[PDB]
């Protein structure tokens, strides 16, 4: 039977500090994304397309530390990583240290499909993606007041 | 960190992981998320895995590949391998976090040694299960 | 690519790998050399490994850790694991290259599936062996 | 009991294209470096210090594609990577895409020993190493006529 699982991160998620309504925002976002994946699998979409779309949506979701809602580095910058692997072919693609790609998982899929490489980093990963028509963004698009406050608190 | 694993109607496994990394990290630091076999792994012979947690320890322990190798070579079940890596090996190296895994037979595991892991799973054409806290 | 593995008098294993990568490679491409478990791995319980070859396939197959896992979980000898990875698994994925390995018992293996591998080894207090070609 | 092995790259090393004198330069370089390792291990030095020094010497050796003698990228640049792992603690350190560090394996040992991290990349890796007193070099120091000709030939 086709099946999907997703995560949005493991850590010290505190019940005492949450309201039910705050918890439900996360539950609703996870339910919406796993349901999108289930429907795609039911429709005969590939595991590779299902995991890419589920991760793009978790990136898009500002509640999760990937894409929009990315944590800040020491320098108040965003550096994003991602990987995708196809268990059939054992091909994989990955980017690390990218700041100007809205959807790291799509750039990781671009590395797998439009290069002979598994892993690209930094400015070269970005230039590879821009040469293939992927759009350049300002890392400011990832910034959320919630994650900026965790940085200020972290200091 | 976010991730997804899936087994499709053709019996193919895949995995993806994406992260912002760790709050206040040194510029240039890479964790497990983009490392094949650490934060992300899939193989139709075994399992698809996506990890979340203290990246350094997931790299040192090759967490995602270790699930597969424990099943493939060690003959562990998904549940046995998940327990071994998340509940024994990663804490022994000072690692905290969790992962999601689906095996080629469609068994699913969402182990974590943390207070929480934002997670969900579902069989195609069924209602999904969501979770934040421990069971 | 260059590398080194060693077992010391205290019984500690270590591995290192360093490369310039590939002539004419795309700027930003990372091969196996810097990736824990792909181009480099060491565990006192198992093996130290340094790899050299078609990096992408060493990453996909987790070549260095695969040696350790085959010995640790599969109960393969160093020679058996080296044969499995370098002569069977890497060529099956279209990979070519080789590696050096030393296990916790001090067995040393320098497998390669290529025309050559620049290599050398020696026991403490014994005469060193060098090699370029096969045989 | 104690033992070292080293490599300088696996590939299509062609006997037809080599003179014996060219081959002996490789044998001499490998022999010198493995003997330094043996001596260090005989003397009770740690496996981690033995592999770090053996790799720094293979980086230093212009005959091998690491450090001095690094191949050129498509852009006629050098991008260097390295990793080191300690089988006792399972600590590891690694750098990738570094151009201004003479010895990548020493920068990777710096990551292992002087940071809480396992892997640093690019300018962040370089800045971390410079903050810990490692010298900045021009990537020009890695360039050799031999490797530049292999780029033109490709
Ligand atoms: Cl309520
Ligand atoms: Cl002669
Ligand atoms: Na997000
Ligand atoms: Na060199």
Residue numbers in the entry:
A (entry chain CCC): 3 to 157
B (entry chain DDD), C (entry chain BBB): 179 to 313
D (entry chain AAA): 3 to 156
Lines from the paper:
l-Asparaginases hydrolyze l-asparagine to l-aspartic acid and ammonia. The prototypic class 2 enzyme is EcAIII from E. coli. EcAIII belongs to the Ntn-hydrolases, which are expressed as immature polypeptides that dimerize and then autocatalytically cleave themselves into α (∼20 kDa) and β (∼15 kDa) subunits to form the mature (αβ)2 heterotetramer (a dimer of two αβ heterodimers). The same Thr179 acts as the nucleophile in the autoproteolytic maturation and in l-asparagine hydrolysis.
Arg207 and Gly233 are responsible for the anchoring of the α-carboxyl group, while Thr230 and Thr179 stabilize the γ-carboxyl group of the substrate or product. More significant changes were visible in the region of substitutions at positions 206 and 207. In the WT protein, the side chain of Arg207 is responsible for presenting the substrate molecule to the nucleophilic warhead and for maintaining the pattern of hydrogen-bond connections in the active site. The isomorphism of WT EcAIII and the mature variants (space group P212121) greatly facilitated comparisons of the structures.
